[PDB]
Structure 1
């Protein structure tokens, strides 16, 4: 029936988020915290 319609179509976001957030999301907080550490020193 409907098995090959959301399996890959759903896990695509799961595969992509690794390249997306890691260079995109956590980069913001990491750079901000590191810069605030620089001001702390």
Structure 2
């Protein structure tokens, strides 16, 4: 049926979203956490 438009595309989407998240956004939260820890310590 009409399956070769959203499943493999969706897999590419969640792969790139996982990459972007883990490489960009989590590091900002980690950086703010460690900065608050450092200037608090």
TM-score of the superposition, structure 2-length normalised? Answer: 0.82
**Structure 1 outlier segments of 4+, above 4 Å:** none
Figure out how many residues of one structure are paired with residues of the other and give that number. Answer: 41
Ranked by relative contact order (alpha carbons within 8 Å, sequence separation 6 or more), the top structure is 1
Return the offset for 1:28: 0.6
- 1:1-41 CA-partner distances (Å, limit 9, x unpaired): 20111011111111112221111011111000100000111
Tell me, which stretches of 5 or more residues in structure 1 are unaligned? none
Q: Could you list the runs of 5+ residues in structure 2 that have no partner in the other structure?
A: none
Provide the TM-score with structure 1 as the length reference.
0.82
